[PDB]
Amino acid sequence: DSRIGKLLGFEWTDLSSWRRLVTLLNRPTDPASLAVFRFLFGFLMVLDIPQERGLSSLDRKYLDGLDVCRFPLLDALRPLPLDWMYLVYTIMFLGALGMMLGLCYRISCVLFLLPYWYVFLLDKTSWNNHSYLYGLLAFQLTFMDANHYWSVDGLLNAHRRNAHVPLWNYAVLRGQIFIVYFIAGVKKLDADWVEGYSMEYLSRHWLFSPFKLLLSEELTSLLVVHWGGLLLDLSAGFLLFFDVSRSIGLFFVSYFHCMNSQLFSIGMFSYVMLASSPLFCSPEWPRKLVSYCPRRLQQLLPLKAAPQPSVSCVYKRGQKPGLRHQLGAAFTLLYLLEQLFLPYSHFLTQGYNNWTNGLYGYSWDMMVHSRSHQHVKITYRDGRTGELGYLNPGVFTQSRRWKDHADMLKQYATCLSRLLPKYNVTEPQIYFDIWVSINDRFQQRIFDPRVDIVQAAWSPFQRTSWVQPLLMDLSPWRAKLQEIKSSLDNHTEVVFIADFPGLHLENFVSEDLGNTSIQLLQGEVTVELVAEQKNQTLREGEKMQLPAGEYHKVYTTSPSPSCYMYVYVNTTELALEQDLAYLQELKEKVENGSETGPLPPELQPLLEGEVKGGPEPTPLVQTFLRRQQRLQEIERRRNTPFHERFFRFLLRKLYVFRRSFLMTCISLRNLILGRPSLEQLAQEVTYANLRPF
């Protein structure tokens, strides 16, 4: 009756003592909405396992014999053989089905939870924010009585058909969703998001077309995308709770999630969040919806009678709370407190700290940092001969997150140290030099290029000494940089570098990049040409013309970091483009009747379009024909009806699911009966990789 107790659902007196808080978190409630969320979540995970978890492409990731570098959270974890991995994924699928249909719920939740976290912890390069959310929701749902309504276990056991559930299930779920929204909102108060640097180019998508009818492109790219996102995160946290402001909240959140689904390729995150939004409605909306149906349809829909008493809730007559009620209340409070604390727990695990904070995956800092890499070099020194060699950038790896994070770099170095000695390299010392920029800043080194990473020092609870600090003092320069970058022609390209004192950059400009120049913006550098061993000292605003096809070094001699730039034009491509344009112009002139003189023999293949009964085409002819074919293909792709695209999408997904099923069957047969001859295995694998059509 009290106003303050009706907008929150509990009087203050219910929090006076422990025995009355346990009686509030175990109040009876209708199980209707929890069952619907359970069904949708299980179905979505069933759909998700063959697509994002990687059951389709599991035969090329964990292939036996292939030597690859793994990035597990713990060094003790190791993948099992491929067949047992397929068995693990089969257990995941069975558990997801059990959650969907509510059959053996408490065993199905375990069978889905344990394999999922094994896969999640086996690789650090596949930690999104939605995988963590799925794992957390499974962990919560393992303890919630969500099989009371619309479940097969209800049909089997008569004490769980339309039975009450304690209130703390809804409390935990709503708290999780609110934490997601609110922590995302507060994390998006970084200076980059509120200024318009994260997702700067997203305003060009056609879905933002109506907004441009009233605002310019830049304001649409600042007010709508960034500030709108922040405000929507906070408001989606708060509005859905209160009854007065739920329709508006549901509308905005649904529009937000549909647009996110179309704009990005996150996966099932948007649909899962859409499913989670109705949890804030009344606990009995499916029942009232079922009531408003014809009598004929109700013979298949769930029941509509009031739920029966359950032995998992405390009823007010009195009843002394038992043991499971207290554990439920404690679990709710502790879990929510831990979820609040974990995103801000980076002052304990300082080893994973970098330019950003902590490993990506559990901070809810979605779409806030964009990184661009310019170069990566790996150098090694043999411990016996003393020779120096250079390795490929990303050899023996299946992901590109080892560049940003130091803990993964240490594992990469150790893996290379173990693998190299079979290529005659004894006791290598491995150095790294990586150029990365975040949110359109100056390119700068992320790791020290003089430290032997193989025999360096790294602990999870201490700061790494070989990670360069971010030069945020050069942050305000960005407004100038675009002005420099927007004044160039259609051929010129520009690169920006900022370098530390005492370090030098050695660069080998290719023979194609003629007309390359270096200009200094801030600091003091000396540029050395090694061809004649001549070095020139440069002051601010001095331009130099570098060779094309020789080494050159730039040393930073100032006491503070120095910022400079490269401006280059690809002369070879320009000459090729002019020649190709001339050839196309001559062909057009011949076609329209001009240039009445007989065509050269080299031009004859161009008009004919087929090299038959004549000399092989020149490289210019081959390039022109390739460009013509590519243009025709693009034109054909653009001019396609919608239904063809939808049909191709459905066929591709059907192929993915079919390959997953057939490979899993082959693996299970290998496990149980045995392994047939090689020819039979090859034939079966060929059958698996067959387009449906």
């Binding site: 990687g54 661009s372 310019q374 250079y390 660069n507 080998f508 490269y566």
Partner: protein
């Protein structure tokens, strides 16, 4: 796997310019 000195010190090389939203599923398949 070994690469020459010249190819390992070529900063100005054509790279696949793009951003990096780490919360995006990789394509996985190809033509």
């Amino acid at each position: 796997l070994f690469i020459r000195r010249e190819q390992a010190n070529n900063i100005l090389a054509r790279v696949t310019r793009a951003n990096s939203f780490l919360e995006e599923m990789k394509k996985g398949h190809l033509e």
